[PDB]
Amino acid sequence: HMTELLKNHVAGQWIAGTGAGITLTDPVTGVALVRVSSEGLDLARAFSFAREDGGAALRALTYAQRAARLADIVKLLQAKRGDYYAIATANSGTTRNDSAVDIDGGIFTLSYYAKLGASLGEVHALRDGSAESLSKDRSFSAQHVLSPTRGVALFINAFNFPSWGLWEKAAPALLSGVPVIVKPATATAWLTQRMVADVVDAGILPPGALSIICGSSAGLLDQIRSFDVVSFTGSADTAATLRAHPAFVQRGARLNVEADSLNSAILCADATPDTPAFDLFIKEVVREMTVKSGQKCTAIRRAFVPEAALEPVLEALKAKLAKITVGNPRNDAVRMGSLVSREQYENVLAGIAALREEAVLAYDSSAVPLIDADANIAACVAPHLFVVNDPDNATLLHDVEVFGPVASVAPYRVTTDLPEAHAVALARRGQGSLVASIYSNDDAHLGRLALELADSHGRVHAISPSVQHSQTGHGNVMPMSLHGGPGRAGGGEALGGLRALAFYHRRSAIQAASAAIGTLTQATHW
Amino acid sequence: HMTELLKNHVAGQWIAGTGAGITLTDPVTGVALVRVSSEGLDLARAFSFAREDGGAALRALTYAQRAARLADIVKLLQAKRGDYYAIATANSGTTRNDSAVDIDGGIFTLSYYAKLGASLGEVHALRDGSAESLSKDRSFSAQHVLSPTRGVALFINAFNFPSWGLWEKAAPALLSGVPVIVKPATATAWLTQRMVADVVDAGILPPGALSIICGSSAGLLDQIRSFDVVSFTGSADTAATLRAHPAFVQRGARLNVEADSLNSAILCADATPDTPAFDLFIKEVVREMTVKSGQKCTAIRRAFVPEAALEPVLEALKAKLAKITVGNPRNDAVRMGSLVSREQYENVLAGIAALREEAVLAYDSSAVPLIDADANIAACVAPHLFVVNDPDNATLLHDVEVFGPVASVAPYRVTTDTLPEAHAVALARRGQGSLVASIYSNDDAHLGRLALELADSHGRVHAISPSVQHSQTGHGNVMPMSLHGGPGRAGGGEALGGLRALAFYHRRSAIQAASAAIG
């Protein structure tokens, strides 16, 4: 008959959507995999069962009891990784090492929060800061506290990280006692739904704590109320429709947005072709263009290098990109797989054609035949490297994101009265980004330059020879560090270790006699 | 023909608006005071000059340098308090003691931030937390930092606090290196304009750091950009119109909202009439209904008391309210002045008539003759106290805010089994999120436990008991070291809370680097 129709888990029950559903397909082979549908679901019940039953059940447990359930989920996901790697190969067309960024990235992030959470103790509220006297005699004092929000957390997640986007958000939400409703992007929804089905089947979390809807998003935001939270990852276009909905404009629900981000990499003036730091730069650029076919939100899109260094840069990138083979990830000779879908492949080819009108194409290996795949079926795109000689006057470099294995290089004028001042200005023209990386032989220089980029980048990632062996990667998101960025990148904050708990809590100043603050404090932790 | 037209301070210059202007009047005597106008101002240039010239100039300074300028503002405003009190009496109609909540509250807050900022030192960015290893051998690490946003701070401020609304917001903004543009509510804008004019005239801050526009708001939000921040204080319905603007929905500018808040006071089951907690509760309710004629955002609007205590509570409130004399604040016999205007007078009276459709009016001193004021001219409203016998089935109680010397009392059911106030907690939460709830008991430990039950729906929980009768800082008084704001109906905003306030004006970033580069 037809491929499997994945059920939704809502109000404590597995429920199928009506109709024919939307088919997910293998972006390499064109094979139909599974279908999704949310048609006819009772969204009022889905949200009320989560918010009431789900939230009460979670709030009755302490942080440490919730953290122990996260640890149990870690052991479950780890035991089923073989099933996960099989879905990733078919649904996303990624190499095994690239599938690991999503699978094992998600599982590592969940484990981090399970360990952090065990330290929060057997309490139901947390202390923010210490107590402060409000009187000369200290008879009357103030203590701030954090309490779980009496709402649900709705995650609208991007197609690139069906696993990591689930767990990076769900770990702090569930540790904070807040029930989760996840809505993965349709094209790659399968891994998200299987991971949720696995956890729900195991009965680790209370009923109502974890729900999933796949298919149309129609009607979800209409269920959002003032004590709920929403975390959206997607396009800047979509983000502006979302922001205008009454849930936020009239009802004031908290919202996090992650959106388009034209991340930068800056080769410092001292890192000339003869020094160790030059090759670190070449290597990282090619890495971020090619991991998942450049489908990380954090991937380098703009690379800025001294005028003098432009030729040697273009030559070194050409030579490294040449080693990147493209095709079917089932073949071990393949270095880089497909984009997530043929639809995205069209977006990316359109993006390349619009950039070509203002830039020169320095590298493009599109004529090379794919390994074990047909270019007229598969969503494979070859790396493309553009050159923009006049970035001050460029119309498209700083504005148009191409969500593929594509990047533009541009020279900057060395300031030799920071030497990297013009590069700092150019990175800013991206109007606000998740991350910038910076490359130098000089560790002390990196500190100064980093502060110059800090007010327009959520993370600044500095690479130099003393950390060639230890630096954690431009595009890789360590969960103990902030993830998000200002401006175009959306104005959002996630992760950052303990920092992530605040989005899910309500903060309150308690002002009382000192013995009352003492008793409050006995019921809390930090 | 014609009172003084106050000028705007924009793009480092004083510029009058065109046209006739809108007259500000004394809400007791009806005297014309000053005029305001923003008509024909070049807003693109006002915003650009603050953003570019102002921001660059403030970021050039360290946190300690900026805090030193704040200390110099403190000394200036203190020397000018005589002028400020005279403006407050005429434009706002408040007694000397209630004026002081705005004037001396502002100065106190600004001075708190001046002292806090001196401790931040000779640096241009702040560390958020400590450094953390990202590698087995610790050669690679991370440190989060806070850096001033490269924007402007636009404050749209409510009529009730023309001084404190300016300085509570401006103090952390300017300490954080962010230029300020203030838009005070028209009816009481004079004191804000005069404070800004004194500061500007003194040359304490760089040109572009401090700007003011008084008059129509048209076109202001159109100038807001993605790195700017906006703090709005006003009605829920105006907040919702504002949230839909492109500045936020498309450009993503940060926004804080303070709006309607039906703040609660809960009398605990142990606080019976023969105990000292009982009188503390009676006094606090009276003070919150009457200071500034009930025009604090944080005033008690709902008071919840055990069924057994309902009659003694009504009788004791009547007795205290009857001592509250009303009229011209110029008369030292007057305990309570006017509302800010004759328009607010009408709004409050319509609110009173609306509540009375569902509640019994238990106390009303409307017929008592005013002292040195004409009821047909002045904006004096007497205290009104309502009783709602069935708060579980009441509508209006929990939904309709009367911004005047008006409150409602309602009984709750004491729970006898293994908190006694469980029902009062539920009733507080029906206000859909508030700035503040206060709680009253003889038992300090009990107040600790109860406070945690209200914390998820109130930005501040304020406990009053005999051991702090002399030291408790008041239900409605905002201490700048403590969080101000609340969830849900109250707006979802956060301000103050000492150093916590700085974060709204900064961008946070994780820096990951060689351990030498780090910290």
From TrEMBL, chain B:
Q: Which residues bind NADP(+) 3?
A: F159, K183, S217, G234, S235, T238, A259, C297
* Keyword Nucleotide-binding applies: yes
Q: Which residues form the Aldehyde dehydrogenase domain?
A: 14-469
Reading the lineage from the top rank, the first entry is: Bacteria
- Binding positions for NADP(+) 4? K183, S217, S235, T238, A259, H484
Q: Name one Pfam family in it.
A: Aldedh
EC?
Answer: 1.2.1.-
Q: Which amino acids does the record list as binding NADP(+) 2?
A: T186, S235, T238, C297
Q: Which residues bind NADP(+) 1?
A: N157, K183, T186, S235, T238, H484
Residues given in the record as NADPH 1 binding sites:
K183, T186, S235
GO MF terms held by the record = nucleotide binding; oxidoreductase activity, acting on the aldehyde or oxo group of donors, NAD or NADP as acceptor
Please name the InterPro entries in this protein's record: Ald_DH/histidinol_DH (IPR016161), Ald_DH_C (IPR016163), Ald_DH_N (IPR016162), Aldehyde_DH_dom (IPR015590), PaaN-DH (IPR011966)
| Amino acids binding NADPH 2 | K183, S217, T238
Query: What keywords were assigned to this record?
Result: Nucleotide-binding, Oxidoreductase
The molecule here is called 3,4-dehydroadipyl-CoA semialdehyde dehydrogenase
Q: Which organism is it from?
A: Paraburkholderia xenovorans (strain LB400)
